[PDB]
Subunit: 620 residues, 2 copies
Amino acid sequence: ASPFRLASAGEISEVQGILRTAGLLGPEKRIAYLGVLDPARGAGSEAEDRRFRVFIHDVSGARPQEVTVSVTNGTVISAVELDTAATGELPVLEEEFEVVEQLLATDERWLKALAARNLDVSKVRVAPLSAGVFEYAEERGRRILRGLAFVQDFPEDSAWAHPVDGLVAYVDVVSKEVTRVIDTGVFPVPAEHGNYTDPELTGPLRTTQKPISITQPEGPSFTVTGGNHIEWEKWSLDVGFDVREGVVLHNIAFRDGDRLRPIINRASIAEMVVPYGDPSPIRSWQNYFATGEYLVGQYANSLELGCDCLGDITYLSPVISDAFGNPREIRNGICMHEEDWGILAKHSDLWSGINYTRRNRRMVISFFTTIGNYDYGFYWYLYLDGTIEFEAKATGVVFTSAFPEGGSDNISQLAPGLGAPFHQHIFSARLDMAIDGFTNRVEEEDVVRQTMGPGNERGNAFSRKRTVLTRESEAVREADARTGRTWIISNPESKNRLNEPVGYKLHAHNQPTLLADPGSSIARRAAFATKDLWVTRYADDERYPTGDFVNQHSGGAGLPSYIAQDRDIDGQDIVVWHTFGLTHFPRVEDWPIMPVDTVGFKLRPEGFFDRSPVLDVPAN
Amino acid sequence: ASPFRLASAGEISEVQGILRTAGLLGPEKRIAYLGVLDPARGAGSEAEDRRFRVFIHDVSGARPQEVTVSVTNGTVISAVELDTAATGELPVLEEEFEVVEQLLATDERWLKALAARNLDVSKVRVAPLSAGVFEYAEERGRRILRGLAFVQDFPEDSAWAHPVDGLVAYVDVVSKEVTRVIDTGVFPVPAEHGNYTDPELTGPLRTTQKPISITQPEGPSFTVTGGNHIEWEKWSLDVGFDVREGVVLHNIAFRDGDRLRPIINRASIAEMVVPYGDPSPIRSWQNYFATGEYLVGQYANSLELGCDCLGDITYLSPVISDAFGNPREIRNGICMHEEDWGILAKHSDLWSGINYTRRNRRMVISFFTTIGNYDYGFYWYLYLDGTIEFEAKATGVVFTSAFPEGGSDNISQLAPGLGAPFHQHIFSARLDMAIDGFTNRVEEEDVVRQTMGPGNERGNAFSRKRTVLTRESEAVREADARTGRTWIISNPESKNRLNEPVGYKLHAHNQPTLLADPGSSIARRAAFATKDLWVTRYADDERYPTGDFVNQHSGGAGLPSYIAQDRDIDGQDIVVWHTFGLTHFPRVEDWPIMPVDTVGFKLRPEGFFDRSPVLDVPAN
Ligand SMILES: [Cu+2]
Ligand SMILES: [Cu+2]
């Protein structure tokens, strides 16, 4: 009966029925997004009304709509017509990916470009990439996708090994017409194949790896109730799933003695953008928001036991809607398990003669998604000591291009004639804080060096300083690794036994943020990625750092607009948005399939407890 | 027969015999340090001549000596008298530790200070801390230790919970004289106990943790031959142990096809210092060089199966010398095992229909040491993909003090009246590089942002630059996380199939470096800690960033002096010295025993291989 329970296949089927009956789901309509709405602030309203938010696309060219329906009452709460040229286009439909390659296949300009390169059109795959917004005036209001070509020699061939550079096309997926085909010149299509399962490339497989058996003879230490409510080593939370954000953690709390203390109300990766840094007109427009434009949850993989998740795994199989409102189950799309995490605490004391050692553990909640050539793993970790951590694992096949004769300052060579354009993978973690309640505040903590002199005659002293962020206008912060800068979220009304406000400290990896020029389209559309940390006043409609309709939006939506309200965040219901990412200069080692690389962040208790919260852990 | 084999009990006894025969080890002598000497560069002697280096202390006050002997030929190669007042005192002897408390127990000044605080001398433990170099003229040429007091209420009581602030004494451990007793005033001695094994504090132990079983039915995948030669998943290396540095990795190489390719000739933590930032006269002199002054290997813990090292573990039991030259085994002092490391590579390709997933693994070589209140774990990891990583784990009990009534800018409060002085844990990793051989060079790589304009009209382009460090004078580098700065060690004479010099990229955590004022004693003595990266030309006698004798030694030796030679490091036999550490502002959560915190670095291949080196990893 939990208001945070996962959507059922029936609920999605009910939304479909409601929409159809209301006349909002005709033959020309398509569901571009469908997700359950979280309970509003204030559970005073007995029995929560299960509501779903829906983005309805019209393949006829008619205006799309944002609809809210109550599955509890079987009614349409609201239906608003959208002006895409103003507020942005709806997310890309899976069924739209195909149209790009199919439409180009009969376009004379495209066929001529391929003929010149002696490429069989039946062997040319086309990657359907988001368009963004640039100098093409005829695109505003129009739903466009840009296509880049790759040759697939045979059904099981990895097309990524054969990019067709010097060629790009733009297509209007609704009017179904190729608006433009640009051919800047022929580039040799890389010849070597990148088939990592081909013995000629892998060579003899290793026979040196002995098995590692990870088991739990008495089962897991965590309990799953209500389908998605998790309880593990004092932790309490609800694992939700949204087609846009993927796995979302709700009501993260820690049982400290006799009371369940909240830490974070909602944690999610609210956006993920991959900006490319190759100035070639063939790719200079390339920026794909996996979350905002494509909806990462939608492409979550079914995780195979023993391969994707090892040990004693408890799966969750979330259900999403297809383009027509039919429920589709993502079998084993979410993995949950606990794993040993080395030494937790250790000390051999000479004076007391007591030797003490305790092991650590982490609760893991994860899912893996595939976006064309890339595959991303999203992992949330809960540690015994109260630490919360997120880790993104980037793998898959690198997006390729030709490697220019004479080299390049924006592309690396991975194989003969094969290039890999420089790019970044930048995430935004939206953390709706609730440190011992909703009355929170954020402080920027910097290490402070001291000069040798009076009060510090030996010049050994060093300190720290904390600055409270009181208004949103001063809540857009940058990292400063040199000064060990961190951010503390505390509750000025809840103090520990030492009369100090309880808190949690966010430790960032301090990786580079968005590198693009400040005046670029991407810097405007993904402004969140230009700064490491943002703090906003909580608001029901401020869900994504990039706004609700990212696709082809002119820019400034999301965080820049929210922050413009300059609201009070000093001891209020606030939300922390942390930007973190990888800057990728592909290596030869990343080809033909790249080894996982990682990035993340974590929050550790900072005077939240009255002493170590793991003194009750057994020797085992 | 391997010249990189661990020292045997026999060799140590032989050294003792040689020294005795040479008249260098009479009853007044003590071995302060003893270690095997690594073989010199180039195949010198027809066979392998085993040599040991020893620092001989004299308990009567006579000048100590540095001696090198050949255990094979039974001769003293060299023996030099040391002028400690100039070049430094020898490492602290374990037997000198107790001298401090013993001598103070009968000193009138000390007794009066304790009486003024109503403390029973029989219950006052004294921490024997390194003295360093300050303004005390009488200390020149004397082996001094400074003592700080802690009250131990009973045999199994954690004295750290009861610091006696406002009091410190200096002691000459050779002449057995208390040179000074400083009392700046009485401070209340914190009353609360910090006994983490007392049920009154731990409360009932958790019964919610279910067992996690990690086993290897067919045994480990790595082989150990010649006692310490490891071969695992293409990696090859020798695990050495030195009483000063602890675990040292030799000849790290990777089998790429038919050739064994060297990567790192020698890897070790050449120094680690813990500088305190409390300006109080009671502790403003506190800086302990665990490695250089105390010799961390000496205090390596015997690691218990299931507790310290979980899974299928293979142990090494290194042997060291005791103060008299007798061999002493550190039973199970080194743990070696492989562990699963999640997903290695993964891609679900729509076009080819091929779904691919491979898991990762890492080889772990570690040891754990105890220095008074702190306990440090040293971990070296080797991954399937060629990555090499080091991780230090800091735990134990925080060093305490009283917490001043009016608060403090250099101490945090852990409990009523109990303080924890701010401090840092800074390590120095000495990496004698050998990327495909000894002809190496280092390049500093920074991300390069580009301005929007001609050639980059959309302002999306970004690049990078590499600067070769050609001379030691330009090889003292700082971190720059904002620009994603890394350092690449390459071999300009060994190129991959794409005609690019093979290399490895060092990824630092970019944590703050030494915070002390540049004019402080510690900034001079721990000069290496002020910069993130140093590159020197290899030399037989340049072993530690702080020189051979750190104890009570001024600046003048170590890295700053090595760099002054301004030698050519562009395509030469070079050594990388990486500084990395933790800046600790103790939290209430760190008391009464602190949960592990970590810091480290890693090196990933950068065009070292011609493609991913893990394509031959099997599915299962
Ligand atoms: Cu990438
Ligand atoms: Cu510390």
